[PDB]
Design a protein around this motif. Structure first.
Motif, mmCIF file in Angstrom:
data_model
loop_
_atom_site.group_PDB
_atom_site.id
_atom_site.type_symbol
_atom_site.label_atom_id
_atom_site.label_comp_id
_atom_site.label_asym_id
_atom_site.label_seq_id
_atom_site.Cartn_x
_atom_site.Cartn_y
_atom_site.Cartn_z
ATOM 1 N N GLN A 1 27.282 11.665 27.380
ATOM 2 C CA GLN A 1 27.451 12.852 28.210
ATOM 3 C C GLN A 1 27.635 12.397 29.651
ATOM 4 O O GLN A 1 26.671 12.152 30.375
ATOM 5 N N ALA A 2 28.893 12.268 30.066
ATOM 6 C CA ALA A 2 29.193 11.990 31.462
ATOM 7 C C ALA A 2 29.367 13.257 32.284
ATOM 8 O O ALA A 2 29.452 13.170 33.514
ATOM 9 N N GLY A 3 29.409 14.419 31.644
ATOM 10 C CA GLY A 3 29.612 15.662 32.354
ATOM 11 C C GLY A 3 28.339 16.194 32.970
ATOM 12 O O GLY A 3 27.585 15.441 33.590
ATOM 13 N N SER A 4 28.101 17.494 32.823
ATOM 14 C CA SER A 4 26.853 18.092 33.275
ATOM 15 C C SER A 4 26.185 18.857 32.140
ATOM 16 O O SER A 4 24.965 18.790 31.969
ATOM 17 N N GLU B 1 32.608 16.161 20.700
ATOM 18 C CA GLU B 1 33.418 15.262 21.514
ATOM 19 C C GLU B 1 34.515 16.016 22.258
ATOM 20 O O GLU B 1 35.669 15.585 22.287
ATOM 21 N N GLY B 2 34.147 17.099 22.934
ATOM 22 C CA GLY B 2 35.128 17.914 23.622
ATOM 23 C C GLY B 2 35.450 17.420 25.016
ATOM 24 O O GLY B 2 35.627 16.218 25.228
ATOM 25 N N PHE B 3 35.541 18.335 25.975
ATOM 26 C CA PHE B 3 35.840 17.943 27.345
ATOM 27 C C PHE B 3 34.629 17.284 27.986
ATOM 28 O O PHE B 3 33.505 17.785 27.887
ATOM 29 N N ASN B 4 34.865 16.149 28.634
ATOM 30 C CA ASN B 4 33.909 15.412 29.449
ATOM 31 C C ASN B 4 32.793 14.793 28.619
ATOM 32 O O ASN B 4 31.949 14.085 29.177
ATOM 33 N N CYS B 5 32.755 15.037 27.312
ATOM 34 C CA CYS B 5 31.976 14.250 26.369
ATOM 35 C C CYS B 5 32.888 13.544 25.381
ATOM 36 O O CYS B 5 34.041 13.926 25.170
ATOM 37 N N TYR B 6 32.328 12.507 24.771
ATOM 38 C CA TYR B 6 33.085 11.541 23.992
ATOM 39 C C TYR B 6 32.195 10.497 23.327
ATOM 40 O O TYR B 6 31.097 10.196 23.807
ATOM 41 N N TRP C 1 23.887 20.495 37.765
ATOM 42 C CA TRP C 1 23.449 20.518 36.380
ATOM 43 C C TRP C 1 22.417 21.629 36.215
ATOM 44 O O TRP C 1 22.228 22.473 37.094
ATOM 45 N N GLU D 1 30.780 24.940 33.497
ATOM 46 C CA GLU D 1 31.404 23.956 32.622
ATOM 47 C C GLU D 1 31.105 24.210 31.151
ATOM 48 O O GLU D 1 30.083 24.798 30.794
ATOM 49 N N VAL E 1 31.882 21.885 27.228
ATOM 50 C CA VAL E 1 32.497 20.755 26.547
ATOM 51 C C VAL E 1 33.706 21.169 25.717
ATOM 52 O O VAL E 1 34.617 20.354 25.519
ATOM 53 N N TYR F 1 42.672 18.273 29.720
ATOM 54 C CA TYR F 1 41.667 17.330 30.180
ATOM 55 C C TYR F 1 41.933 15.961 29.565
ATOM 56 O O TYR F 1 42.660 15.831 28.577
#
Ligand SMILES: *[C@@H]1O[C@H](CO)[C@@H](O)[C@H](O)[C@H]1NC(C)=O
Lengths: 194, 114, 106
Positions: free
Chosen positions: A142-145, A152-157, B52, B96, B98, C49
């Motif tokens: 989790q590099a996002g917030s 594994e969507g946006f900003n996670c992977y 956050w 935000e 995901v 993205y």
């Protein structure tokens, strides 16, 4: 006296991914290494401490055979004082390492037509690894917030990633099987000998 | 059916301060990440801040001296108190995901410093 | 503060054709680039993205691609609703930053 199971390590048929490299203690036994160095079947045999021929006449107290599978061209990172995604995020050797690294090409044993995607490796991590430490978790990084809860969507992977180990790959891109033997000499008597 | 009830833009002074909040509609602002973006007429978008849920925040190149963010999870209102000074911008407060990936925003606090 | 740029600051391209918009990072942005779309009267709509992950729902005529130093967004076809201002956002390093770039028709 007994014989050490170097056969059940070097000649074991299932190595694990480098992100989850498998450690096996060797102790209460006595075997040899100057037959392995004599075997000449290996393609990379570097003993960073004592020279390989001399070591058969020694005795050791903490032997740990560490086994994993990497790519042929990334083997240089299995060495003290080394950068590289393997040596950074997966498996660091201490700068004061005293042992042997044994890498041999294992293209046929591993590289399927569809690839052996059991072999993974860590390509993301917050920081590198103190030597001989391992990370086994498979949380989605989790590099996002927001908490992405395994998605594994946006900003996670995913932090781990596969290997396309197939016979069509180049020599350096074919998988190598790697074993590392560490011979500590600390406050203890020896249990392994020659 | 999510939205931000933004605090209306104040008419501040050059050198004064202000503070704006955005209440949540539809979503659970308790464990999402809330971004603050300012779009200045006569310019383009400019990322301002990210918050956050667990009190971890990060800021922008010029808005890292007189800005301070918070998330009033009791009122579910993502807020911030800022200084002022070259800040007349239409601030958006997006939150935000995901999956969607920041697909709900604020509605433009028309803050000016003059 | 990593800064980005978009060379075609405005392009007058007509309907039903194919265009591109390039973002260029004065530092290294491995893959996590996002393409945003904004129209006056609308709200910015995060199109892409990771510079390759075509986000769900939006049409397939939006295709991003790039590698760690340069990035492009190709609009293969244009039904007229797809004329807007297009921005890009870097999110490898956490101080996220934007670019500048708009669209026009003949
Ligand atoms: C593993 O088995 C092969 C097959 O005979 C042999 O050549 C090799 O020396 C063996 N290695 C060990 C460490 O037993």
């Amino acid at each position: 006296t007994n014989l050490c199971p170097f056969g059940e390590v070097f000649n074991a048929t299932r190595f694990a991914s480098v992100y989850a490299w498998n450690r096996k203690r060797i102790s209460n036994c006595v075997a040899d290494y100057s037959v392995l160095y004599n075997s000449a079947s290996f393609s990379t045999f570097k003993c960073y401490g004592v020279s390989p021929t001399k070591l058969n006449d020694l005795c050791f107290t903490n032997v740990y055979a560490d086994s994993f599978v990497i790519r042929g061209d990334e083997v240089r990172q299995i060495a003290p004082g080394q950068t590289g995604k393997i040596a950074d995020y997966n498996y660091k050797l201490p700068d004061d390492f005293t042992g042997c690294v044994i890498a041999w090409n294992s293209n046929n044993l591993d590289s399927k037509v569809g690839g052996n995607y059991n072999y993974l490796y860590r390509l993301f991590r917050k920081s590198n690894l103190k030597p001989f430490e391992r990370d086994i978790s498979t949380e989605i990084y989790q590099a996002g917030s927001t908490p992405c809860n395994g998605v594994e969507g946006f900003n996670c992977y995913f932090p781990l990633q596969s290997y396309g180990f197939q016979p069509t790959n180049g020599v350096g891109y074919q998988p190598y099987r790697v074993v590392v033997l560490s011979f500590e000499l600390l406050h203890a008597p020896a249990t392994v000998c020659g | 059916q999510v939205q931000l009830v933004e605090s209306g833009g104040g008419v501040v002074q050059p050198g004064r301060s202000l503070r704006l909040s955005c209440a949540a509609s539809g979503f659970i602002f308790s464990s999402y990440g809330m971004h603050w973006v300012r779009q200045a007429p006569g310019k383009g978008l400019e990322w301002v801040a990210v918050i956050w849920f667990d009190g971890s925040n990060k800021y922008y190149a010029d808005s890292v001296k007189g800005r301070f963010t918070i998330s009033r999870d009791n009122s579910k209102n993502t807020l911030y108190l800022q200084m002022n000074s070259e800040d007349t911008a239409v601030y958006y407060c997006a939150r935000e995901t995901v999956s969607y990936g920041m697909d709900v925003w604020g509605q433009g606090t028309t803050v000016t410093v003059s | 503060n990593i800064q980005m740029t978009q060379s075609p600051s405005a392009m007058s391209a007509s309907v039903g054709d194919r265009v591109t918009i390039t973002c260029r990072a004065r530092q290294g942005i491995s893959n996590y680039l996002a393409w945003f779309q904004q129209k006056p009267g609308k709200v910015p709509k995060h199109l892409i993205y990771a510079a390759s992950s075509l986000l769900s729902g939006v049409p397939s005529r939006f295709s991003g691609s790039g590698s760690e130093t340069e990035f492009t967004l190709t609009i293969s076809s244009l039904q007229p609703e797809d004329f807007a201002t297009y921005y890009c956002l870097q999110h490898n390093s956490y101080p996220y930053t934007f670019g500048q770039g708009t669209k026009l028709e003949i």
